[PDB]
Amino acid sequence: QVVNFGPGPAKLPHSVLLEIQKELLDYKGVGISVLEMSHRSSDFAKIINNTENLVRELLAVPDNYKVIFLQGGGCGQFSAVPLNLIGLKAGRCADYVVTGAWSAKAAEEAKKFGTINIVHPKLGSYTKIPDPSTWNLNPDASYVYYCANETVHGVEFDFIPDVKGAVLVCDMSSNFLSKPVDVSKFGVIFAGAQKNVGSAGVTVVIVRDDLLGFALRECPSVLEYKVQAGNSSLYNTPPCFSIYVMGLVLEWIKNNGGAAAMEKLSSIKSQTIYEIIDNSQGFYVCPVEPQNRSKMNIPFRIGNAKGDDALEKRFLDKALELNMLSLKGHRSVGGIRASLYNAVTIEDVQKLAAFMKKFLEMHQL
Amino acid sequence: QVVNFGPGPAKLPHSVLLEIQKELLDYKGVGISVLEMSHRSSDFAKIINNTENLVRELLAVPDNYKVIFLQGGGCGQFSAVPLNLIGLKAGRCADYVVTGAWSAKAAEEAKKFGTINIVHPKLGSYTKIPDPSTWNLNPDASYVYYCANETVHGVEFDFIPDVKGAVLVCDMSSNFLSKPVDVSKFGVIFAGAQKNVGSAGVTVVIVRDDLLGFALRECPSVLEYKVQAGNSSLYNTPPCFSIYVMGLVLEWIKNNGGAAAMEKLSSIKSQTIYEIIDNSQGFYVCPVEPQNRSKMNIPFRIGNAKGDDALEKRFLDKALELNMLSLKGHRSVGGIRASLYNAVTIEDVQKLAAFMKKFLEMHQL
Amino acid sequence: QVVNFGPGPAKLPHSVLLEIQKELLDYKGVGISVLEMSHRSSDFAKIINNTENLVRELLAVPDNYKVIFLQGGGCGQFSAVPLNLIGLKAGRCADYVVTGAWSAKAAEEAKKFGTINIVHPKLGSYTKIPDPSTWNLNPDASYVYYCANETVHGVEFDFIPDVKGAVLVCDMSSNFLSKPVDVSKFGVIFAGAQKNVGSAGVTVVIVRDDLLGFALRECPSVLEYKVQAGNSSLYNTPPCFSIYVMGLVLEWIKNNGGAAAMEKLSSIKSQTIYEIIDNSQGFYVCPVEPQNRSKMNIPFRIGNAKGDDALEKRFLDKALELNMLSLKGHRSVGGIRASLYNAVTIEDVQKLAAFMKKFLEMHQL
Amino acid sequence: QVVNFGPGPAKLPHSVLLEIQKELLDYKGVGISVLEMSHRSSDFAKIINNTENLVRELLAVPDNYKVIFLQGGGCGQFSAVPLNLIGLKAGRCADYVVTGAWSAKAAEEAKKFGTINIVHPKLGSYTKIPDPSTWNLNPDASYVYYCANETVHGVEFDFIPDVKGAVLVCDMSSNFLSKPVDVSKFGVIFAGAQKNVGSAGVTVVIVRDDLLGFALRECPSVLEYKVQAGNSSLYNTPPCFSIYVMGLVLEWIKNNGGAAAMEKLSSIKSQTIYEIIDNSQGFYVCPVEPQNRSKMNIPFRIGNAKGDDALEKRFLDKALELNMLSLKGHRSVGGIRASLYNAVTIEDVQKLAAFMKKFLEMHQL
Ligand SMILES: Cc1ncc(COP(=O)(O)O)c(/C=N/[C@@H](COP(=O)(O)O)C(=O)O)c1O
Ligand SMILES: Cc1ncc(COP(=O)(O)O)c(CN)c1O
């Protein structure tokens, strides 16, 4: 009974994988696979339209927003957001809120297309969100960028930051549809499906329809929002099977209570793991400030704040023999990371909860 | 009993889809799905390395070449080829060989990144290939581009042109691994997997190692050849499932005799359909000249050289009744188009051949 | 599911058996079975003429050759060839090239009508074709006989030998129409139709029209080439149903690309098996020198050169459990033998190759 | 609705053609066709042994008699009988009785293998049997040959002739198993299956076991009784499907009363037509003497003895409108010939009887 705590690609609901297996050779009586299905056929037109309607219903996406499915992953949008939006104002300036490895990597990628100004002082360690009241915002910047949830460091926004009245861009790859979102506050929301809403190969991008037509000339057509929105994400061959998988995962989300229930499940799973760390008497330490602790990714150290390597490997190896996968923290941080996306059930978190209390009972003073 | 003549995405071998189904929940005893498999796991490392080895083995790729798997499809490389290569020489110039709709679209996209020079007069109709002795090639061009197989107009190269020593870029989306290729004579080879080596979502790129480090600054990192070769295509989350699907089709290709056998089958499949056209007494009309006729995509008309709309609808309606799918010609050309890719079997073409004979016998005057 | 690797009689195309089944009671509306059809009727003249034209068309038989259909099988020609041709020169001598079991049988049978001389030294094993330079040819011999393909030992000519201008008689029974043939180089070609062109009961004999009229006095009139050629194979009641079946198989070969396509298909098929043997690391042994390996019959042993009986039985027992018939080698040789004639499809050879690979993976020490 | 009066190949029972059609693709559930079956398999062993058992049962063939199945038809035995038996005595003589065209052909063919003495003077008209007591028999002759039923002239033996202890050979091709036979009185019986007991392609031969081993050197192996009886008709590939068809016809004759009932059913059929001729008052002319009239073939003329070409054409034209096929007389006699073999039912003959009665009533002067 494997329990997959993958960081991305992640666990998919067992119910969904069972339907993908059944329909793999004959999708709902059409006589062919989705892997063989044409993106121009009427069969796939209903698949991609259903996926889009499930994005607009679950997130309550206003009618003045375009929902498109592109390739290239989240790292692809690190280039797509500037190429499409850095030309909103003549200065070609952009403000970036760096709270972890991904918002940092995004700001570096944005330097290829203009002058990038980070809005706050560089944090010594990614352990908190700089107070937005201290944000040095440029009134001539084309947009403001920030990552809602840092998968490696465990820093998550529990608010939508006030950014004057400027265009707001948000990376929700690791917390997409984990909680309801007031979409109207955002200019562009993008998320890789391989984390919380499907399989790797497709990236959902929600754009306000007044931001189309500002893309730079060097923006590749397959990544230009205006081109891709005008063709309903069918400018070229899209990731057909990936969109079909995401729709089934989206269907699973709607059946289990929508975005409102996902947030409640994400509270229970994160709290039970955090309360084991807060009561660990120092044995488990999470360097993130309590007001910004991510509910999707929980990276922690064992024993001491610097990380007892001998104790961590024993934790990983004994978790492996218990069929708990991908608990090893990121390479650039080490330590332990526990990913608690939507597919991760509460029974799966309890196995991790009982295993962490028992491992502390056997190693702590 | 469905016979899928899809043009892209296209038919997959039935033995492959059977394995994808029984392993979909537990890949080779790992305990999870490939859809859940992390791209940083030991398990996916075997899959992506096995796919590369098969690309190198089946095509006999020399050692001085990188094999990377990118996202964005074929049209993604229409932008990635200039972004990475057009700065190879100081002129930012490039030569393109337009033989059909796909090379034409490729030249239009490359204009976003430099000065493009189409090396020949505009063909009144894409029915032939201009002789390469008559090519107005620029000695200062960064590369010479051409599409090996035109999927819409059925025009194919049965030779590697003499570009007078220039770097040669080739689009082999619709004939990749349908015949042996001398990889040494090319600078860059790319192909969308959704046509002949698997499913959509992944694009195989074969690059000569001395052509990295010339990418423009606006080139997105996920599409930069140097960045992805220096990461073995794992710069960000790659299309794991599409790479795993492509790996099986490559295994299936090697089991049926490799690229040398695919050329033998493509000749039998294509000739059995061209024979029916050449001996049709004008009932079936293929406008492509014989020296350039594609062995992958055969477009033709019925009734006359311009196409009897009544006969072509009766043809496509009865073809659907016989469970023969995606025979309808491309929206910009109409008529009929039969796609005979690798997975399309001889018993598939024979069913089509018998239907074309019975239909001509019943409707010719 | 049944996969028929029969040596002869062999498998017939499933489309041929399906048509024979539906016309068995009312052949093309005439109201009777072919089994009831008179050999003097207008309907059967159209049948036997169409069968002769297809033989002339697919093999490109010159106009100065007679195409006659006889009874008695190939072993019947072992007597009809001497009876008709051994009196061509007054000496009544014939030179024979023994390359396997069926050449020796034919050479021994010919000793009942004249003095027979084997042109090459007795080979210790039927594993290689003696170099035509080694042949000790009699300039007074009436003809020179050789077997194109040895069905029991797997030794095949991929050339027409030089016989110093003598009349060349060939036994192509087990490779008839598996490849194009320069008929102008031969004097007499015969082939039992039960191996690669039809069912048992009829033999096709192609004789140059000037070799008629040299038959001995003891030649039965039903086997005399001059008598049957003058009666269009209708001197007596011919095997009507066998000739009807043979015509349908000829039509199936023509619809699948004629002799040229059969050579391409027979190359892919035999390569699939030989590649397993050549890379088996001594687990499969094929004694025939690779330059003389048959593309129709692949005899081999399992374990060692002499063959491990315990392993070969387990192979055949498991193969029979998988509905793969007639894999047992010939009685005089034993071991394994795979017959891959024209009707044996690529998927059929793919089931066998996948089985041999798994069997080698389960028992290789 | 078709009434098949064929002379050979002839009508087969509707019951037999049906089971052949049902089992054509999967004989008794073994997976393959009889056309694909190997003559060495245990499946064909049951077929040929049952066909041998039925012949021995329906004719009461003693144990000292061999039953073999050859190729070459009836005319094949015109040469195989002398080749096997003309050397019983050193003189190489053979006594032949020429009562019609088929015994005349056999006598001329036998001259190729020895000196042939016709036992009676030329008849002038094949209308009677020369008295066996006036037969000029050679006491040193190797055998005595005679045709029991002359298919062209309608002259049948209703007795076994006394040849004074000579080895007796009989050509029962056109009345085989139409009546019981005292096999003990014969040395060799043979019959082409295509006239009374199946379809063309196979010949049954019944030989006393002490008449083997007298074949000349020039006899082909496939036609030597000693060779073929020693291998149980499996010296080479036998007409597998033609032997299988014979087994069903014999099984049909057994289910309908054996030879004893066929003789009495043949009496009803022939008496119906012969009486119409006798009472025709010269409108229908049968020149054969009543004591020697055949019960299988009834040749006659219309109008007068020499034949009215006008009436004989309208008879064959109106018979063709009524679907009464093959009623035209043989090429060497012309006129009309009705063949009343076993599968020809009483209901069939009544259609002919009513037609002849109506034609006479409409054109008799
Ligand atoms: C009594 C008897 N003996 C031998 C034969 C020859 O049969 P085959 O040698 O298998 O053709 C035959 C064949 N008789 C047929 C022959 O027709 P054909 O003259 O061959 O068109 C008939 O009477 O019309 C036969 O009737
Ligand atoms: C939050 C977040 N943002 C961006 C990315 C970039 O990944 P990709 O572009 O390959 O989907 C990731 C992948 N770990 C991520 O977790």
Curated annotation (Swiss-Prot), chains A, B, C, D:
The answer to keyword Chloroplast applying to this record is: no
Q: A GO molecular function for this record?
A: pyridoxal phosphate binding
What organism is listed for this UniProt entry?
Homo sapiens (Human)
Question: Associated disorder, per UniProt?
Answer: Phosphoserine aminotransferase deficiency: Characterized biochemically by low plasma and cerebrospinal fluid concentrations of serine and glycine and clinically by intractable seizures, acquired microcephaly, hypertonia, and psychomotor retardation.
Q: How is its activity regulated?
A: Phosphoserine transaminase activity is strongly stimulated by increasing the ionic strength.
Q: Which Pfam families match?
A: Aminotran_5
Which residues carry the post-translational modification N6-(pyridoxal phosphate)lysine, per the record? 195
**In which pathway does this enzyme or protein participate?**
Amino-acid biosynthesis; L-serine biosynthesis; L-serine from 3-phospho-D-glycerate: step 2/3
Residues given in the record as pyridoxal 5'-phosphate binding sites: 74-75, 102, 151, 171, 194, 236-237
Q: Which GO terms describe its cellular component?
A: cytoplasm; cytosol; extracellular exosome
Q: In which tissues is it expressed?
A: Expressed at high levels in the brain, liver, kidney and pancreas, and very weakly expressed in the thymus, prostate, testis and colon.
The lineage is: Eukaryota, Metazoa, Chordata, Craniata, Vertebrata
The UniProt keyword set, sorted, is: Acetylation, Amino-acid biosynthesis, Aminotransferase, Disease variant, Phosphoprotein, Pyridoxal phosphate, Serine biosynthesis, Transferase
> What is the name listed in the Swiss-Prot or TrEMBL entry for this protein?
Phosphoserine aminotransferase
Could you say which cofactors this protein requires? pyridoxal 5'-phosphate
Quaternary assembly: Homodimer.
EC assignment: 2.6.1.52
In the UniProt record, does the keyword Phosphoprotein occur? yes
This enzyme catalyses:
O-phospho-L-serine + 2-oxoglutarate = 3-phosphooxypyruvate + L-glutamate
What does UniProt report on the pH dependence of this protein? Optimum pH is 6.9.
**Cofactor binding mode and count:** Binds 2 pyridoxal phosphate molecules per dimer, each cofactor is bound at the monomer-monomer interface and forms contacts with residues from both chains.
PROSITE patterns found in the cross-reference section: AA_TRANSFER_CLASS_5 (PS00595)
The impact of changing residue 82 to A is: Has no effect on O-phospho-L-serine:2-oxoglutarate aminotransferase catalytic efficiency; does not affect KM for 3-phosphohydroxypyruvate; does not affect KM for L-glutamate; no effect on function in L-serine biosynthesis shown through in vitro reconstruction of the phosphorylated pathway; does not affect secondary structure; does not affect dimerization; does not affect thermal stability
